[PDB]
Design a protein around this ligand. Sequence first.
Ligand SMILES: O=C(NO)c1ccc(-c2nc3ccccc3c3ccccc23)cc1
Lengths: 115, 111
Amino acid sequence: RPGGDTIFGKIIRKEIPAKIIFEDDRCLAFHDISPQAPTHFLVIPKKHISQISVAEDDDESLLGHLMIVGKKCAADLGLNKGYRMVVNEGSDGGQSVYHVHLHVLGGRQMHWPPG
Amino acid sequence: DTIFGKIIRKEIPAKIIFEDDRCLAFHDISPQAPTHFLVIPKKHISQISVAEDDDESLLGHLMIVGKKCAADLGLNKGYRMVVNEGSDGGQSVYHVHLHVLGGRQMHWPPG
Ligand SMILES: O=C(NO)c1ccc(-c2nc3ccccc3c3ccccc23)cc1
């Protein structure tokens, strides 16, 4: 079982269902089950990195790929007026699952501060 | 050009936390948490929606630099990283920037 046994690892291996938007060899984008905006999805690496704080230097291009895929998916979903991308780290950051994930939120005005 | 270009060119003051050959990290002038800094590329990418495939490594570098600076600033209970795009995202400056906020409980939703 590669991809870990967090719920996101199970999603990567298709053991638990999800609403997939995009998939490649490095990542998976799927809709969030508790959406906080009209569109709210997640981009995750297939490689299990538990949190951004423990990312390796050579995870740079993979983390960049999360953002590129996020922005492509936002465009393909028609988020023409923009969006917010969020990574949560740890307890103060509100991280809910210990597998790195980029939130992408749009279809409404996002406010400041970002929580 | 933007105010962030001015900051990169060292034409206006900013409290710089880290610099390398391709990015700059500095405290946000209107902080929304006890720690609130930005990591920006020196290359002028106006918004993440127009970033190119070849920019992947650079964008990843912003996040690795952000996470290293966060550790160095003592953000051991965690933090939140944010990129805003366009009007709905609340993007305030048309130069790509990664926010890093911590030192307090961040809430949900994230705006
Ligand atoms: O307890 C939690 N936070 O404190 C929590 C953490 C993960 C999921 C969760 N997220 C998802 C996001 C996108 C797609 C599917 C799911 C999903 C599917 C089945 C069971 C749980 C989840 C739900 C709740």
